[PDB]
Design an enzyme around this catalytic site. Structure first.
Site, PDB file in Angstrom:
ATOM      1  N   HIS A  15       0.809  -1.214   0.000  1.00  0.00           N
ATOM      2  CA  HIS A  15       0.000   0.000   0.000  1.00  0.00           C
ATOM      3  C   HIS A  15       0.844   1.267   0.000  1.00  0.00           C
ATOM      4  O   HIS A  15       0.277   2.360  -0.133  1.00  0.00           O
ATOM      5  CB  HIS A  15      -1.020   0.005   1.149  1.00  0.00           C
ATOM      6  CG  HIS A  15      -0.467   0.111   2.535  1.00  0.00           C
ATOM      7  ND1 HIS A  15       0.209   1.223   2.996  1.00  0.00           N
ATOM      8  CD2 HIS A  15      -0.548  -0.737   3.590  1.00  0.00           C
ATOM      9  CE1 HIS A  15       0.536   1.052   4.262  1.00  0.00           C
ATOM     10  NE2 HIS A  15       0.093  -0.131   4.653  1.00  0.00           N
TER      11      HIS A  15
ATOM     12  N   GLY B  28       3.306   6.130  10.422  1.00  0.00           N
ATOM     13  CA  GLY B  28       4.651   5.950   9.904  1.00  0.00           C
ATOM     14  C   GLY B  28       5.313   4.642  10.286  1.00  0.00           C
ATOM     15  O   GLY B  28       6.447   4.383   9.837  1.00  0.00           O
TER      16      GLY B  28
ATOM     17  N   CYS C 227       4.248   1.580   9.527  1.00  0.00           N
ATOM     18  CA  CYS C 227       4.057   0.520   8.556  1.00  0.00           C
ATOM     19  C   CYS C 227       5.407   0.012   8.065  1.00  0.00           C
ATOM     20  O   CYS C 227       6.331   0.792   7.820  1.00  0.00           O
ATOM     21  CB  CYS C 227       3.230   1.017   7.378  1.00  0.00           C
ATOM     22  SG  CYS C 227       1.615   1.595   7.889  1.00  0.00           S
TER      23      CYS C 227
END
Ligand SMILES: CC(C)(C)c1ccc(N(C(=O)c2c[nH]cn2)[C@@H](C(=O)NC2CCCCC2)c2cccnc2)cc1
Ligand SMILES: [Cl-]
Ligand SMILES: [Cl-]
Ligand code: NA
Ligand code: NA
Lengths: 306, 305
Positions: free
Chosen positions: B41, B143, B145
């Site tokens: 993503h 942030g 991820c």
């Protein structure tokens, strides 16, 4: 979101752990530049752990009586000296993995990460706090001596604890990296015992602010308190006194959440009176006291879940 | 003595974290040999995230759409592809710090260490378990991820989790390193929720054994029980069923302490039915279920890596 006991990444400290052997005793040392730091009781014999004279024990040692092993490499000891309760071994090789570092002596209530080690090799990492009675509630087995505690704010490792011994209640005592013990303890096998411990009040308050930041307000109430009335109540539950310094330290968390420090003190007074009535705060059914104000700001969002 | 929530040493993983940027999105990647792994993503705009066609969004992308930064060094991207929900970026340099590693998919109830990272920089390490509902109760901010979870065996890192998203209750969802989600979740902005969770029974028993090893014994009693009878209590209190395999795994701890699993099951049964009566176990007022039997033996025996 979420809230966990969170340690610092341990790699910078892993690269400094070595094994130190003297006689039949093995424990851990900390290799920084060309010096290995370890507990001086590595030179204590089994015969006499009760009243060692470390000056007399050490003057009998040659450099080659110390075996230092870094992974698979033997490091050559070329000098030695004692500073308080820490032995400093000079070796012929500087540790190429030495991080930026400093030595700091911490105050009760402060937290730090511990890298538990055996035979110079890391086993695990956890978070601790220096208790008001100058012990730590660690997890340490035989041979963990020389494991260290540290923080790594802003890429600099601040070493604050070296592990020396276990007390009769299963809690732990040690020194700063200058070899001065925290608390009244000594590196002798005596009848020594931790004092009655108390709860770190300013940390409980920080953790209540963390809960509000993460979106839970159920424990607040309509009341306030004076500082002196708060301390008169809290001390009946074996809580440490809250000082004006502590109130000041909590200012930023108070500002982010809109809850005045003495209003959060009133919430804490009621929680001590009432319990949680089957509820939890940040996943706990007890009031947690090993997160500092600084720790909460480090871990939590800067934006409250209103 | 003592007993703490304990994570694996994180150094071998720290040397693999990098920053990945695509457009205005920055998150973390895992750099092993000459490939960087991160959530797919990263290629999405906020508009895309409502109903992304990942097949089409990626064919639109080229190597030069990706910026990979290791410390202060830019890694040049020379290839890209997708495996399930993970983006793979081939770079021109193999990571010289790559540890011995495997990709392993874990089962609910198993624990692992998480190295929380921001902008490619490790920030903290903590321990957590894959819940029966396939979420994790992590601690993650915007942030995070691409942060990863792992276990260590000797010198080999077993990577088992990559972080993708937060659910509305504030728990977290992610994939294995081959991009397969844990749980019935998708990498799209749509209505999703954690299902009803249960308590990991075998882990609670492991922690009761840890408590006995550490001198906490008030919950022991004269009674024993059977698997069938205990499992009726378990279902009543939303505990996972206890299987014969769980009993076998607990064997060591049973032999050491003197409490047969079914003996300890009788203690847990009574704790569920009557509560703790104002007492604590290992400093907790709740029954802890994020220590596995292996975690208890490792910590109580000093295994190193
Ligand atoms: C010589 C001296 C100062 C009395 C001493 C002796 C042994 C150790 N302990 C080492 O494990 C150890 C020593 N050298 C290699 N390992 C352990 C320890 O404190 N038991 C105590 C038992 C009661 C009497 C005091 C010592 C230990 C265990 C678990 C966690 N932490 C430490 C510590 C200090
Ligand atoms: Cl301090
Ligand atoms: Cl798609
Ligand atoms: Na590889
Ligand atoms: Na029993």
């Amino acid at each position: 979101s979420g809230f966990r006991k969170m340690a610092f990444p341990s790699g910078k400290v892993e690269g400094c752990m070595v094994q130190v052997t003297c006689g039949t005793t093995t424990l851990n040392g900390l290799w920084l530049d060309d010096v290995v730091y370890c507990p001086r009781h590595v030179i204590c014999t089994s015969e006499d752990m009760l009243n060692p004279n470390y000056e007399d024990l050490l003057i009998r040692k040659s450099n080659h009586n110390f075996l230092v092993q870094a992974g698979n490499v033997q490091l050559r000891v070329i000098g030695h000296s004692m500073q308080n309760c820490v032995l400093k071994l000079k070796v012929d090789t500087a540790n190429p993995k030495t991080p930026k570092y400093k030595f700091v002596r911490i105050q009760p209530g402060q937290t730090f990460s511990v890298l538990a080690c055996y035979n110079g090799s890391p086993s695990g990492v956890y978070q601790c706090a220096m208790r008001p009675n100058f012990t730590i509630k660690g997890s340490f087995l035989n041979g963990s001596c020389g494991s260290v505690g540290f923080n790594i704010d802003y890429d600099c490792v601040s070493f604050c604890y070296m592990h020396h011994m276990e007390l009769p209640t299963g809690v732990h005592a040690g020194t700063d990296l200058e070899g001065n013990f925290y608390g009244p303890f000594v590196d002798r096998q005596t009848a020594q015992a931790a004092g009655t411990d108390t709860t770190i009040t300013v940390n409980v308050l920080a953790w209540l602010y963390a809960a509000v930041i993460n979106g839970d307000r159920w424990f607040l109430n309509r009341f306030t308190t004076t500082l002196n009335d708060f301390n008169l109540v809290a001390m009946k539950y074996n809580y440490e006194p809250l000082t004006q310094d502590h109130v000041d330290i909590l200012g930023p968390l108070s500002a982010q959440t809109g809850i005045a420090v003495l209003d959060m003190c009133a919430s804490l007074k009621e929680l001590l009176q009432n319990g949680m009535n089957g509820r939890t705060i940040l996943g706990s059914a007890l009031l947690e006291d090993e997160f500092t104000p600084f720790d909460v700001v480090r871990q939590c969002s800067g934006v409250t879940f209103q």
